[PDB]
Design a protein around this nucleic acid. Structure first.
Ligand SMILES: [Mg+2]
Ligand SMILES: [Mg+2]
Ligand SMILES: [Mg+2]
Lengths: 127, 101, 117, 94, 197
RNA sequence: AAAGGUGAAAAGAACCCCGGGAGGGGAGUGAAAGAGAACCUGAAACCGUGGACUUACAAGCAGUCAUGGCACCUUAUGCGUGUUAUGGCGUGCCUAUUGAAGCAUGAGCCGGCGACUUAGACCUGACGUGCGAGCUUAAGUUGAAAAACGGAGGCGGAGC
RNA sequence: GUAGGGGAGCGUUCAGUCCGCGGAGAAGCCAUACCGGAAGGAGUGGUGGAGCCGACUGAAGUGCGGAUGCCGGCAUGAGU
């Protein structure tokens, strides 16, 4: 224990099987669709389903998924063939407001959103 | 060192009745001051006017302001005060500093 | 001197906001609405006490005679009877006696007929 | 009931309106109205015979309840705290 | 009737305000004093006018929701400060007899408690202050109480650059505040202290 | 127009992993990265992930009172906290009105800004203080980490 | 009990004074089944990383849901 301040130093705080693509120029709502088929499974499948799934959000999710893997494995010395998407999700980063002209003088703002795709891989096992 | 906010420059209270809190219009959840229409954010419906008896009432008299004398009552002299001397001075200190008139 | 509202308002708000719990949608997440819900809330709260009193005596009277009539009486009668016997004077717990202790309840039943005709 | 119990039972600690006799042990006696000391069903007056003896356990301040009133359009909103005092009394009587 | 401490010891002299010191009046006092020290400084473009902004906006009607004048008014961020503060004075002349009854009633205060006089302080010697502290000791001034020293004598005062203790004060140009401000009064100079009118 | 804030000090991240990059994970510096440069705190609306209790004969201002079920019990196992089922009861808020759930006005939601004040030796009254049949100063003067001086003048004092 | 009048108080900043508090940790934030007749207050824990409670008195740009209010952020319509 000690007290907060000593803890901060006795510990460093880490993130097992975790990666995160911050600021992917896509709509969270759009990416979620893909991140959703991949939630909770054989990180192999995830690799596989992405290769085929038609949505263009797939690349980024791909990249984050193979980065979270290249961590669980390296910085975490994990056993890859027991790895599975423990958790994944999409949060919205800033928003690229941009102005668009409209009929008869009026104007409009197109919201070009963006997303933080983060995915957490973890060794499975039954027991 | 026990505990004691001390008495003195801080223990110097007001007086009670000395000075009451102001008035911010909002007494209970339900303030929306002044009538309830026909009056606000302005100032002219005054309190005088010249038709409300003022006018209509007859007069021209005539103002003068001649001379105004300094009434020096009798008891001022008699009763007490041992002829402290009227003259045209002492009376002052005696009390009747009117000057001018 | 200037004098913001800072922290003074957030709090006033959290107070209400936190009163609303299982308040459905907006009503439990938006100040204005949540608050407003609590005015009608006043109406019910207050008037419901002066009122569950009304509701409860009803539950009591309902049972008191589904036992009363379980022998051949009925609240109306039954009650005036125990009445006929100043002796008897429960009325409060009477139902319960009629719900849990049948042995007893009968007693009071017949007791009234025996002070009735 | 409307103050000071009655009925049968076995002696439990129940809460009622304040009893005035403070302290504790304050041996309290309640007339009686009905009861079965031995399954003996006993009605009014014929029960007055028997009685109950309970001791004042403690004095309490109920659970704070807020009394709020409200009428619409006419403004009118009323907030006021409240909580009723009592007396704990361990039953034990005849 | 306070016994002098340096170079003599008369005392007795001086009628003191009845009944026994009255905050109310000492309050009526102190307050007034501060009001006077209260300077007038109101940084505020109260004026919807004193702020920078045009004067005609959009369209009274038909623009779809609005109805505005300039963009410089109580209700507009960056507008002007309605009923805001402007410079002023909050200085009034408290009747003289009270300013009198004032410290008078404040001296009492100090007499009834921890009063203290002194006729000259050959006990000083130069500025030093070191020795000024010295005297204090055997003078009862441990260093645990706020001391106010009224007295002319240029060179004497010159000894008081020490905190919490004392606070200097010229030609009996005393003041109900200070006195009531610090603990013990070192009335000193029997100057303003004995003989008036 | 809007626009502030790494750290005490750059010691501002060598080297390795996934990526074209962006980004991130380790390592290392640092008291701290539960300070990393889209760097003090970081509320609310608003989006989302996981968990708990629920929901696919139901008519609902959205709650409230009552009871049962389930879960949990750091101001808290003896009272409760959360959630929920069924029952009763129940016509948003404000404004403007003779009369509003009102098919009458206003308002998407939150945060912050946002409205009875200031001045005049002005008038009038309540309360309080000082003097009191008397009561006061204004301008200025000289001192000021202080306030005294200053009666020009004003108000009581006779009315018609 | 509506307009209105009268009474007692809660809170916010700033100022004077008293008692203090703080890097083994302030303010602010966040959670809570306690306290007070209300406005409101406290305890405990988490966050935070430097200033800060309580008390008496004084001054206030002092308390908000409404104004097709103002500025900013984010929603709905809709992945249309
Ligand atoms: Mg400005
Ligand atoms: Mg209309
Ligand atoms: Mg609004």
């Amino acid at each position: 224990f000690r007290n907060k301040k000593q803890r901060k130093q006795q510990v460093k705080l880490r993130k097992p099987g975790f990666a995160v693509a911050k600021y992917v120029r896509m709509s969270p709502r759009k990416v979620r669709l893909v991140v959703d088929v991949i939630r909770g499974k054989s990180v192999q499948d995830a690799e596989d389903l992405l290769r085929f799934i038609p949505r263009s959000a797939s690349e980024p999710v791909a990249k984050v998924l193979n980065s979270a893997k290249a961590n669980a494995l390296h910085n975490d010395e994990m056993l890859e063939d027991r790895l599975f998407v423990k958790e994944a999700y999409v949060d919205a980063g800033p928003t690229l407001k941009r102005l668009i002209p409209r009929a008869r003088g009026s104007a409009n703002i197109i919201k070009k959103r963006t997303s933080h795709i983060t995915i957490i891989v973890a060794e499975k096992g039954n027991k | 060192h026990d505990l004691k906010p001390t008495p003195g420059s801080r223990k110097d209270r007001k007086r009670v009745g000395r000075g009451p809190g102001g008035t911010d219009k909002t007494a209970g959840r339900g303030h929306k001051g002044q009538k309830s229409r026909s009056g606000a954010g302005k100032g002219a419906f005054f309190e005088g006017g010249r038709s409300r008896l003022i006018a209509r009432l007859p007069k021209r008299g005539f103002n003068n302001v001649g001379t105004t004398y300094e009434v020096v009552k009798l008891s001022q002299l008699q009763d007490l005060e041992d002829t402290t001397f009227d003259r045209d001075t002492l009376e002052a200190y005696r009390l009747v500093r009117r000057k001018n008139r | 001197p200037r004098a913001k509202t800072g922290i003074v308002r957030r709090r006033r708000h959290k107070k209400v906001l936190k009163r609303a719990k299982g308040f459905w949608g907006s009503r439990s997440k938006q100040y204005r609405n949540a608050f407003q819900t609590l005015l009608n809330a006043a109406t019910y709260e207050y008037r419901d006490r002066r009122n569950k009193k009304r509701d409860f005596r009803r539950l009591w009277i309902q049972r008191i005679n589904a036992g009363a009539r379980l022998h051949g009486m009925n609240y109306s009668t039954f009650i005036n009877g125990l009445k006929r016997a100043n002796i008897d004077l429960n009325r409060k717990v009477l139902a319960d006696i009629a719900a849990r202790e049948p042995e007893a309840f009968k007693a009071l039943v017949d007791a009234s007929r025996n002070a009735r005709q | 009931i409307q103050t000071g119990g009655k009925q049968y039972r076995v002696s439990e600690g129940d809460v009622i309106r304040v009893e005035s006799l403070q302290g504790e042990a304050g041996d309290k006696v309640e007339l009686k109205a009905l009861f079965v000391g031995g399954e003996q069903t006993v009605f009014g007056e014929d029960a007055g015979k028997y009685t109950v003896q309970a001791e004042v356990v403690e004095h309490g301040r109920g659970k704070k309840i807020y009394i709020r009133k409200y009428k619409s359009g006419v403004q009118y909103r009323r907030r006021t705290g409240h909580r009723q005092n009592f007396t704990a009394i361990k039953i034990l009587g005849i | 009737a306070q016994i002098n401490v340096i170079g003599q010891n008369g005392g007795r002299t001086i009628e003191l305000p009845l009944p026994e010191v009255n905050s109310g009046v000492l309050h009526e006092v102190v307050t007034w004093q501060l009001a006077s020290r209260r300077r007038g400084t109101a940084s505020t473009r109260t004026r919807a006018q004193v702020s920078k902004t045009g004067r005609k906006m959009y369209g009274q009607k038909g623009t779809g929701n609005a109805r505005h004048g300039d963009r410089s008014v109580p209700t507009f961020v960056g507008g002007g400060v309605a009923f805001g503060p402007k410079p002023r004075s909050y200085d009034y002349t408290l009747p003289r007899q009270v300013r009198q009854l004032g410290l008078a009633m404040a001296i009492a205060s100090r007499q009834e408690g921890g009063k203290l006089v002194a006729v000259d302080g050959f006990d000083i010697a130069d500025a030093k202050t070191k020795n000024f502290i010295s005297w204090a000791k055997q003078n009862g001034l441990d260093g645990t109480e706020k001391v106010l020293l009224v007295t002319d004598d240029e060179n004497t005062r010159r000894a008081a650059r020490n905190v919490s203790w004392v606070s200097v004060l010229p030609v009996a140009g005393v003041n109900v505040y200070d006195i009531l401000r610090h603990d013990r009064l070192v009335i000193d100079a029997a100057a303003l202290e004995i003989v008036e009118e």
